[PDB]
From a paper:
We determined 3D reconstructions of mTXNPxred incubated with and without luciferase, which yielded structures at 3.7 and 2.9 Å estimated resolution, respectively. 2D class averages revealed well-defined features of the decamer ring and a globular, central density that was present only after incubation with thermally unfolded luciferase. The overall size of the central density attributed to luciferase was consistent with a single 63 kDa luciferase molecule. Local resolution analysis identified uniform higher resolution (~3.6 Å) for the core of the mTXNPx ring and lower resolution regions for the inner face of the ring (i.e., 4.4 Å), indicating structural flexibility in proximity to the bound client. Remarkably, in the cryo-EM structure of client-bound mTXNPxred, we identified an additional inner ring of density that extends from position T35 and encapsulates the client density. Residues Q31-T35 of mTXNP were modeled into this density and identified to extend from each peroxiredoxin monomer at the dimer interface to form the inner ring. Based on the position of the N-terminal extensions, residues Y33 and R34 appear to contact the bound client along with additional residues in the N-terminal strand of the chaperone that were unable to be modeled. When refinements were performed without imposing symmetry (C1), the density projections remained present, indicating that all subunits likely make bona fide contact with the client, although some variability is observed. Thus, we conclude that the luciferase client is likely bound heterogeneously and in an unstructured state that, as previously shown, is competent for re-folding. We found that the N-terminal extensions of mTXNPxred become ordered upon client binding, and directly contact and encapsulate the client.
Residue numbers in the entry:
A (entry chain B), B (entry chain G), C (entry chain C), D (entry chain H), E (entry chain D), F (entry chain I), ...: 31 to 204
Write the structure that this text describes.
Amino acid sequence: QMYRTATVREAAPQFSGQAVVNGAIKDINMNDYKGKYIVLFFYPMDFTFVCPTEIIAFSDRHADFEKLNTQVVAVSCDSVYSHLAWVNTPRKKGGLGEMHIPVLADKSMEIARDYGVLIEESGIALRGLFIIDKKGILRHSTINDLPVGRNVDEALRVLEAFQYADENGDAIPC
Amino acid sequence: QMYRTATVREAAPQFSGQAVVNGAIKDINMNDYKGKYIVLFFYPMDFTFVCPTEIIAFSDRHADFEKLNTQVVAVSCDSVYSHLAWVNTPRKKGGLGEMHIPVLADKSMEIARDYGVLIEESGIALRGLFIIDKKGILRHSTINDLPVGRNVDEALRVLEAFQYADENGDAIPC
Amino acid sequence: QMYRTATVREAAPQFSGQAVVNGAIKDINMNDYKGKYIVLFFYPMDFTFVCPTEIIAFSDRHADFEKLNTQVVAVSCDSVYSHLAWVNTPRKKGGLGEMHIPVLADKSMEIARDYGVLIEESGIALRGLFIIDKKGILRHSTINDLPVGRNVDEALRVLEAFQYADENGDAIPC
Amino acid sequence: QMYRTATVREAAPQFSGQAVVNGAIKDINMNDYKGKYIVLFFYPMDFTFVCPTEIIAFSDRHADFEKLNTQVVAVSCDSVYSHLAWVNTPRKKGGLGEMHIPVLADKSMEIARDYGVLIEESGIALRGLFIIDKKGILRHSTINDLPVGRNVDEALRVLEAFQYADENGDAIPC
Amino acid sequence: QMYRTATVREAAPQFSGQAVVNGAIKDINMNDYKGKYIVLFFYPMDFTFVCPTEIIAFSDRHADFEKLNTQVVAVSCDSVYSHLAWVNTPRKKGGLGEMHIPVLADKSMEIARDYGVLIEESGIALRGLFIIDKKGILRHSTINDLPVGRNVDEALRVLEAFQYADENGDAIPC
Amino acid sequence: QMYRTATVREAAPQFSGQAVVNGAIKDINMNDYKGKYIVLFFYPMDFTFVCPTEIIAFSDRHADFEKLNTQVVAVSCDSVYSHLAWVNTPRKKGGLGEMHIPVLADKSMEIARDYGVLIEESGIALRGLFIIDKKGILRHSTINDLPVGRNVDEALRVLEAFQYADENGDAIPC
Amino acid sequence: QMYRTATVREAAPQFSGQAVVNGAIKDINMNDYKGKYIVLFFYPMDFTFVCPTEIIAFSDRHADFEKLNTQVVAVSCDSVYSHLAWVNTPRKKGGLGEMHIPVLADKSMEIARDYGVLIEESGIALRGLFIIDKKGILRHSTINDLPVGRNVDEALRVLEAFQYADENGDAIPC
Amino acid sequence: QMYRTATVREAAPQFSGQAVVNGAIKDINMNDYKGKYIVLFFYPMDFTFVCPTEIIAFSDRHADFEKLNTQVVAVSCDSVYSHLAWVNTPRKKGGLGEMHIPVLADKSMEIARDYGVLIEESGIALRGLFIIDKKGILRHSTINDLPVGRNVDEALRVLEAFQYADENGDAIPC
Amino acid sequence: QMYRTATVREAAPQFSGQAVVNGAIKDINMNDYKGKYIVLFFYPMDFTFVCPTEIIAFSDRHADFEKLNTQVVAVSCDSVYSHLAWVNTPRKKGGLGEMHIPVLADKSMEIARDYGVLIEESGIALRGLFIIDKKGILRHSTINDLPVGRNVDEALRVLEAFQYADENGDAIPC
Amino acid sequence: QMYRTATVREAAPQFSGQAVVNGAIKDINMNDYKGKYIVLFFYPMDFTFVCPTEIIAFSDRHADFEKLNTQVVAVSCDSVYSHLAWVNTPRKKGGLGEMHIPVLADKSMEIARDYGVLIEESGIALRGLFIIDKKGILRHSTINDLPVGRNVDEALRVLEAFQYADENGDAIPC
C-alpha cells in the first residue's frame, strides 16, 4: 500500500523510540549505533505464557556480539512501560531479569510496519531477525512465524559470515 | 483520512478482541452487551509509573454500574497478555489486583483509531470515556488529554442522566 | 469530508464572531483570550423549553473561573441577535438575565462544524465542552448528547487538574 | 459547487422543517400546500433591531392571499424555538404578536442553500421572495439585499399576474 | 456547471456589447456607468406579439432614474441589428419609437448566461431585473417568469431604498 | 470541445424549432423533409444594413428547387419573432416580402453550434450552405465568411450534380 | 479528438511538404506565399479513373489567379512521387500534362487531418476548397463530397469577392 | 500509444483493403489466405525513382512460393488506384508490368500502423517483411530501413525453415 | 508497485516452470507437492565462481527432508537448460553432479519477483530460503544477501520446529 | 505498456552489462563501439540442446565484420557466468570453444525488454538481429521466432548495403 518496507538489498529504514537499556527508559536510535552492526529481534507479545527462551538466549549470548562489532536491538510492538515491567519481573515468572539488550518498543507500530513483520489485524510483530550492516544496508531478513523460534547459533553464523566476507571483498573462496 | 471515527449522535463502531475478565483471556465483543450500556475507558499505557487511581476507581465502583444497567469496558492499545500481567501484579506496585472490569486490548489499534482517541505517532490512546446506549448509539464523548484524569462521579452523573431522560421521553422538566 | 475537526491532542481551530458580552453585541475572538484557558459550551438551541439550568450554572459559577485563569465562552449555532434577546429576557421565562459569560454565536456554523459537535441535518450543536489550554491546544473534549446535561463540578475538576499538572511537569504523583 | 439552486423556469426544491403556525411548533412541508401557490419570505436574522415592518406587512395582508389561492411561507435560517419566542414577544419590542403566517425555520440551512439566498460566511438568508406556482415550478425570484425591504404591493401584483395569465393561456393581450 | 452566475451579495459580472442608444449601434460597457447604478431589464424575445408595455414603461419613466443617479440598461439575447429595427419600428405595431434606454444585445448569450436568467434550450432570457450599486455589487435580483411582467413602481421603490439606506449607514430606523 | 459538429461524410445532426413558413410561426423539423434534399442557408444577423440580396436570390429561385426534389431551409440564430418581422417588412427597407422559404430560427444556437458555423463570441452564424441528401447524410459544406456571399448558381450546380450522380451509381463518366 | 481542425473565422493551420511545381519535387510551404491568397484543392485519389476535369480546370485557369493576387495549391493525400508520375503522364490517359499549379502531397496526412477534409478509414481527402486570405485567416470552406466536383467559376467569384470587400472595408453596398 | 503493433510471437493483426491482383482492383483479405502462409512486403513509396528491383524480384520468384504453400502480399501506403497505374506502366519506366503478386494498398495507413513499420511524419512504410504462418501467428519480422533492400534468397530460406521445422515438431536436429 | 510479494503470515504465491529433477527437464509445480512442506533455495547465478557448497549441502542432506515430510525446491533465475548443464558438469569444476533436488528455473523471473528476493537491476535472486507449510501458507522467510550463505542446520531446526508445534497446537511448552 | 521499445527509424536504446570477450567477464557498453556498427544476436537460451550452428556461424565469420567496420554483439537473457561456462565448454558438447564475439548477458532483461524481442512469460529472447549504424540509429530489425534460425549471408548482405548506400547519399542507382 506504501512505505515499501525494508528490503534485503537496499537500506533499512531507521528505528527510534523509548527502549529498555539496563532497566531504564532511555531513548535509542539507529544513528547511535552507526559503525557497528545491528540485529533486531521482533517478538510478538509482552508477558507471553511461553517461557521466553528465545529472547533470553541473546542476553545470555550478548558477549558474543561485542566480539563481532554489533549490538542486538530487541524490539516489540508493546508499550515501553510494559517492557520495563517485563525486564523487572524476575525469571521463572515469564521474566527477563537483567537483560543486557536494548529492548526497543515500537508501540507506535510505525517501524514493524516498515520492516514488514507486523500482522496488521493482530498488531503483533512476526518473530523476525534483521541484520543491518554498518553502511545502513539491511542484509539479512529472517522472519519466522509465531510458534517457531529463532536461534542464536544461526544469528552468529550469518553475522560472522558478513564481516569475514566484507573484509575479504565480496567472495568467499572456501 | 477515512473511517469517520465515532460521533456523539450516530452509532458507535463495534469493538472486539481478547480481554481480561476476572483474570483470564476471554473474548469480549460489543454484541455480548446488547441491552445494557457500555462505558469505555481508554487509558494510554500499560504498567505506567503513575499509581493508576483513575482505572481502579471504576473497579472499586463497579457495583454502581450494575445498579444502572451498564458494563464498563476498560480498553487500552497494549497487548492482552500485558494486561493480564497488569491485573495479576498486586497493588502498591502499579498493579490492578482483582479488577472487576473487562479490560479490553485493542493491540491492533483498529478500534481506538475508530473512536478517534488514538495518538497515531505515539500509539497510545487518549484518556477517553465513551457512553454508548443500548440502541448502539454513542451518546457521550469525554476525551481528556494524557496528564489529567477522568472521574467516576461524573461518569455516574451523566450515565444516570440518560436513563432518567430516555425513560421520560427526551426532555427533563427540572 | 474535510477540515479534520478539532482533536484532543492537536491545536484547536480558532473561533470568532459577534457575541453577547454583558448584554451587548461585541466581537469576540480566540486571540483576545491568549494566556488564559477557554471553555466552550456548545448548547443546541436558543429559547428552548427546558429551563436552561445547564448554562446558568456557569454564569453563577463565573467567579470560580477567574480564580483558575480561564474564561468560559458559551456558544451556539443561533443568531447573535437572538442570543441578545435571550440574555435580555428575564428568568422564569426561559431567560438568562445578567449572564456574565461571552455567549458566542456561530450562526455561520463554520466553527461548530470544525469542532465536530454539529448535527448537520439539524443545524444544532451537540452539548459539548472544550477546554483549550493557553498554548492553543485543545485538551478536553466532553461532548454529551442533547437530553443530558454538562456539569460545573466536573468542568472545574478537570480544568483545575491541568494547571496543577502543567505547572508540575506532566505527571501527578498522587 | 453543486445543488444547482432553484431556477425561475425549473421546479423549486422542496422545503420542510418545524415552523411556527399560530404560535406552535408544527411541521410544515411544501407538499401540504399542493394546489395553492406558495410565497417564501427569506429574512436574515431573528430579533433584529429593525422594527420588522417588512414581515408584519404580510401578516397584516394575509387575507389578500387567501383571495388569490396562495399561502405565504415566511422562512429564516434561525432556530424554530427562536421564531416561537419571536412570535410570542409582543410588538413595540421587535415582536410579531399573532402573525398569521407559517414562519418556517431552516436552521439546517439546507433550503436557503438550495434557493441560493444564503450568505454562507454569515449564515443569514438574503431578503428573498419566491413564488412557486401550483405545478411545483418556481416562477418569481425577487432577492433583495439586506438593508432594503420587500413589498406587499408588488408581491400581490405579480402573484395576481400569474393566475390571470395562466388561466388565459400564457399571453396577456393588454 | 461553471461561471457561478451573479449573486445578490457578490459583485455582478460585467456586461458589454453593441447596443441601441438613441437609435444607433453604439458600444456600451458596464465601466461606462461606474458611479451610477445600473438596472438591467432582461426581456426574452424581440418583436414579440405582446404589446411591450413592460419595456416602454421604463422609457416613459427614464426621467425618474436620472433623479436617482442610475441608468437602466435594457438587454435581450437577440441581434443588435434586430433591436435597432425594433426601436425604429413605430408603436401600435409592436414597436419602441424613441426609447431613451440603452437597449443592449447579448446575442453571444455570454452575459445572460452569467446572470442565470437564460433558458438554455430556448435561448431567451427570463424577464429579469438586476440592480447593481456603484461599487459593482449586484444588490437586487428580480427574476420573473415569461408571461408575467415587471413593474416600474417597484423598481423605483427598491432602487430608492438603497440610496436612502447606503447614505444612512446600513440600517433604516423607520 | 464536444458534439463533433456535422461532417461532410457522416450524417447531419437534426434541426428543429419554430420557423417562418409563408408568413407564420410554424414548427419545422428535418424529419418533415425526409425523401427530399435540404439546403440550409445560415446567415448571420437579422435586419442587417446590407440589402439582403443573398437570401432573396433563393426565394426568387425557389421554383428551381422543386424541380430538383429539395427544399431550402434558411436559418439564422435570431429570434423567430424577429424573422417574422423581417419577412413582414417590405423590400427597399431591408425586407423579405413574401419569401417562399422556411426561414428557421435557432435562437437556442444549439444547431448552428452543431454545424460548426457559429461564431461563439459573436453569436452569429457564418454564411454557410449545407446540402443533406435524402439518406440524412450531409454532403456539401460551403461555409463562407461574413462579408462575402453565397450563390444560387453554384448551389444549383452542386445540388444537381448529386442526383445526376447518385442515380448513376457514384461515378460520372464525363 | 484534438487539433480542432481549421475554422472559417480563425487562422488556417500551416501546410508543408514536397510538391510538384512545373514537373519537379520542390518543397512548398505556406510561408512562401505570404501576401498572396492561397486556394487549396483537396482531391481524394491519384490516377483515378475519372478524367480529372475538376483539377485541370484550374491549371487551365491559372492566369485568372495571378490577376487576383493568389496561388492555388492543389493537394492530395498521396505520395509526392506519385503526383510527379501523374503530372508526367500525358492527357487522354488520366493525366495532367503541364499543370501550372503546385500539387502538394500530404502523404503524412497531417494536414488534411487538420483541415477536417480527411476520411480517416479511407485515407483520402474530401474534395475541399479552402481560401486563406493574406493575413493567414481561413476564409472560405467549400467541402464537397467525393462524386460531385468543384467549380472554377465559383472559386473565382468568391475569391474576387473578398478583395473587392476587404479593400472597401467589410461591407458591400450593392 | 496504443494498438500494440504486431509481435513476432503473438498473432498478427489482420489486413484488408483494395489491392491489385493481375491488373485489377480486387478486394483482398487475410482470411482469404487462411491455410497458406503470407509474406508482406511493405515498401515505402509508389513510382519511386529507384528501379524497383526489390519488388520485381518477388514477382519473378512467385513460382517459388506456390511450391512452399504461401502467397506473398505486397503492400504500400499509397492509393490503390496509384498501384494500378504502377502495375500498368511498363518496365524501364519505373514500372511493374505483369506483377503476379497481390499488391495491397493501405492508403488508410491503419495496417502499416499496426505492424509498426510506418514512419508517421513521412506516411511511408519501412521496407518490412512479415511472415505469418497458417495459424495466424506472425513469425518473422524483417524490417529494413529505406535505402537498403530486402532479399528473395533469405525470404525463401526462412520461409522454408518454418515448414521444415513445424512439420518436424519445433526442433531442428542438424 | 504491485503483486504484494509473499508474506510470512499469508499464503505463498505458486511457482511453476521447467526444472531439473534427476538430470532431466521435467515440469514441476507447487501443486505437485501438496501435503508436504516445500523449502525454496533462491540462489543468484548459475556456474558461479564460488564452489557452491551452499546448494550441495542440501543435496547431501536430502535424506533429512524425507524424514521431515518435505521437499526442498531449489530455484534460480537462470535458464533451465543452463541448470541442466550445471547439474551435468562434474564437481571440482563448479558443478552439481547427481543433485537430488528439483532445481527450478524461474527464467521468466515472475516468481522470484513475487517472493521479493529479486534484485531487479541485476536480475539475480537474493539467497533466500522459504518454508511453506502444507496449508499453502508461507511460514519462514530467510533472505540473506549475496556473499553470505544459508545453512542446513538452521533450515532443519526451524523446519522441525513447525511440525513439532503444529501437531501440538500452536504453543511450545519448553 | 511503456519504454516504447526500439524502432527501425529512431535511435536504438543503449545496452550494457557484463559480457564474455575472449573468455573473460569484461564490461561491454554500446558507447565502447561508437563509430562502428553493431549487430546484436538475441538468442533465447543457454546450453540448449540444439547444436548452436546459428551463433557459431558468426564467430566463424567474424573476420567478415572487421572488413565492414562493425562488431557483432551476441546477447542473451541468461547469466553472464553461464555464458562463460558456455564459451568454455568445448564443441560437440553444445559448446562455443573460442568464440570471437562479445557475448553479452542481459540477465536483468532490461535490454531485450527494450528491443521488444523478449517473451515475457518465458523470459527468453526471440532470435533477433539488430543493426545499429554509427549514428546510434537502429536500422535493421530481423526478429525470427524460436525454431528457425538467422543467417550470416543476409546479415552481411544488408550490413554491406547500408555503408554502400550511406556513403553514396541515400539512393542506390542500380
